[PDB]
Amino acid sequence: NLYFQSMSRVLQAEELHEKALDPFLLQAEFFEIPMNFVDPKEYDIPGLVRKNRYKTILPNPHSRVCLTSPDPDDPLSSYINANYIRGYGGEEKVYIATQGPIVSTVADFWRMVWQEHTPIIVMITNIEEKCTEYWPEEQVAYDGVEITVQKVIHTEDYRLRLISLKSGTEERGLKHYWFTSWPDQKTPDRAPPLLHLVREVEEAAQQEGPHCAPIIVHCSAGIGRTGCFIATSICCQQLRQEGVVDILKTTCQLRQDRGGMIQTCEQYQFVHHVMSLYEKQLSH
Numbered sequence: 467n468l469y470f471q472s473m474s475r476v477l478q479a480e481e482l483h484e485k486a487l488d489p490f491l492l493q494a495e496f497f498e499i500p501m502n503f504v505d506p507k508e509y510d511i512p513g514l515v516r517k518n519r520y521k522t523i524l525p526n527p528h529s530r531v532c533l534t535s536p537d538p539d540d541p542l543s544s545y546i547n548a549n550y551i552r553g554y555g556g557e558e559k560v561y562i563a564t565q566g567p568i569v570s571t572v573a574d575f576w577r578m579v580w581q582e583h584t585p586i587i588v589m590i591t592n593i594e595e596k597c598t599e600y601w602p603e604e605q606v607a608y609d610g611v612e613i614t615v616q617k618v619i620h621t622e623d624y625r626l627r628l629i630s631l632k633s634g635t636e637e638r639g640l641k642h643y644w645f646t647s648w649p650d651q652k653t654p655d656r657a658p659p660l661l662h663l664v665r666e667v668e669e670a671a672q673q674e675g676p677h678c679a680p681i682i683v684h685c686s687a688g689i690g691r692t693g694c695f696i697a698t699s700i701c702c703q704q705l706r707q708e709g710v711v712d713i714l715k716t717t718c719q720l721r722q723d724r725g726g727m728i729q730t731c732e733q734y735q736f737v738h739h740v741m742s743l744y745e746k747q748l749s750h
Contacts, residue, residue: 469526470500472718477711479745486654486738489731496734499717502526503725511541516570518547519596523565523687525549529723531562533577546574547688549724550680551696554703556719561696562680563724565688566597573608575600579640580611580631583679587642588667590684590691597686601627601642623647623659624666641670648691652736657743664698664740693720693727697737702744711741 475495477485485491504524518524524547525531531548538544546564553560562582566589567575579587591597605614612632619626627642645663649656671678685691697720701711717734720727728734 469502469722470718472722473499473714474712474718475714477713478709479749482711482738482745483742486735486742489735492735492738493731495714496731499714500721501726502721509541509545511545513542514545517542517545517574519565519568520687523547523689523726526723526725531564531578531582533574533581535577535581546571546578548578548682551683551723551727552719553696554700554707559680560678561699562682563688563692563696563727564682564684566591566684566686567600568598572598572600576608576611576613579682580609580633582682583638584682585638585640585674585679586667586670586681587640588645588663588681588683588695589643590645590648590695591686592648593646597684601629624663643667648685649736652732652739654739654743657736657740660695660698660736661740661744661747664695664702668699668702687726687729689724689726690729690733693717693724693729694733694737696720697728698740701737701741705741705745705748711745713737713741 504526506521506524508527509524526549529549531546531550533544533546548562548564550559551561551563552558602613602615605612610633614630615627616630617628624643624645629640629642631638631640643663647659671681683692683695697713697716700716701713705711717728
């Protein structure tokens with residue numbers, strides 16, 4: 467309750483199924499949740515306009531990712547439009563929510579990946595787009611790190627790139643999940659593919675072992691789709707642990723970390739469809 471008083475609505479199975487199908491109650495609830503957007507005038511940095519795809523969608527200062535190499539003291543050099551996001555139960559820095567890289571921010575995004583030892587990127591952008599193609603066909607170096615795409619795995623609903631990051635003696639792997647099945651219509655029947663992504667990614671995160679480095683999630687602005695992904699992930703853990711979901715409270719927690727997470731009412735509803743689905747699957 468740091469930037470606003472968070473809200474709660476604990477759903478057991480039956481209310482979750484019913485809630486997901488009550489759009490009047492969903493909007494009533496949704497449009498009461500504080501957006502917690504940042505005043506653009508918060509950042510007074512020459513050159514900053516080139517670093518943001520949208521002038522009004524900015525990282526909240528208190529949780530922004532600051533790029534400490536090569537000049538932690540230069541506002542511009544240290545800036546990226548990204549926030550650390552708490553996961554389930556408030557675990558610090560489970561995800562990073564960020565905008566889709568733009569031409570002038572590609573090198574910055576990789577700086578972030580390296581700084582953070584990020585093992586997994588989730589990119590949620592249709593093939594028809596917006597977002598810049600920030601990874602190489604095969605290989606490229608930025609700022610002393612060699613990005614090598616080692617393999618492209620095509621699945622029904624995403625393409626998985628296995629990437630090598632090299633600098634010095636040292637070397638790390640990265641999984642890059644490009645999700646291409648994001649619906650224009652957020653109807654129940656378009657929920658299974660996002661569910662499958664969430665599950666594939668939480669498994670992969672588990673496989674990283676104790677204290678996983680931050681998972682980078684991005685769509686155009688880093689709030690709408692990005693927020694849907696992350697809330698769904700959190701609520702999957704909550705349902706499995708607690709036998710209930712609290713998407714209201716999860717959304718609130720998300721918006722404390724980064725303003726506008728889950729941007730639309732149709733997105734909010736979609737998280738409910740997905741979680742209704744999962745609960746049904748989990749009962750078998």
